[PDB]
């Protein structure tokens, strides 16, 4: 599909394709649309009865559908 | 100042104040306005000539002012 907002595909001097995130000013080799990466310290992944992933934060002792690695909901 | 968007301060049955993030559906004891917490694996913090923190991602081999722990820019 389309790149997510703020991202651009570029080509370097040698003709290699890479990706730029203008929201953070990073560049990276992998397409951000593709898609190990560990969860941050103190977190675990579990699955609901329906097989939907969710995230357990043992630091704060809370849970969320939002993957802390990506900011994306497991429900979307 | 004000709570950040999506957050609410609540009181529990015992009268203890806690914080709710309706964007992620977590709750937590700490005020989100206050604000260990390690950087994620493969990251380091450095400082510019001006003493401004920035973040080095050795996984992707890139750098950013945006703290991966918070999504907030070191420049804001």
């Amino acid at each position: 599909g389309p790149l997510p907002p703020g991202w651009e595909k570029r080509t370097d001097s040698n003709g290699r394709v890479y990706f730029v995130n203008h929201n953070t000013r990073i560049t990276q080799w992998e397409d951000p649309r593709s898609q190990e990466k560990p969860l941050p310290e103190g977190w675990e992944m579990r699955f609901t009865v329906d097989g939907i992933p969710y995230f357990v934060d043992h630091n704060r002792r809370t849970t969320t559908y939002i993957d802390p690695r990506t900011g994306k909901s497991a429900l979307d | 100042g004000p709570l950040p968007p999506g957050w609410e301060k609540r009181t529990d049955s015992n009268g203890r104040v806690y914080f709710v993030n309706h964007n992620t559906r977590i709750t937590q004891w700490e005020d989100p306005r206050s604000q260990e917490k390690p950087l994620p694996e493969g990251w380091e913090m450095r400082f510019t000539v001006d003493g401004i923190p920035y973040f080095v991602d050795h996984n992707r081999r890139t750098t950013t002012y945006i703290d991966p722990r918070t999504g907030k820019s070191a420049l804001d």
């Binding site: 570029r10 890479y18 560049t27 | 081999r61 890139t62």
Partner: peptide, 12 residues
């Protein structure tokens, strides 16, 4: 041999 991606400022 790993290679870093191009610098934001060199590129942009």
């Amino acid at each position: 041999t790993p290679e870093a991606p191009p610098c934001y400022m060199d590129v942009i």
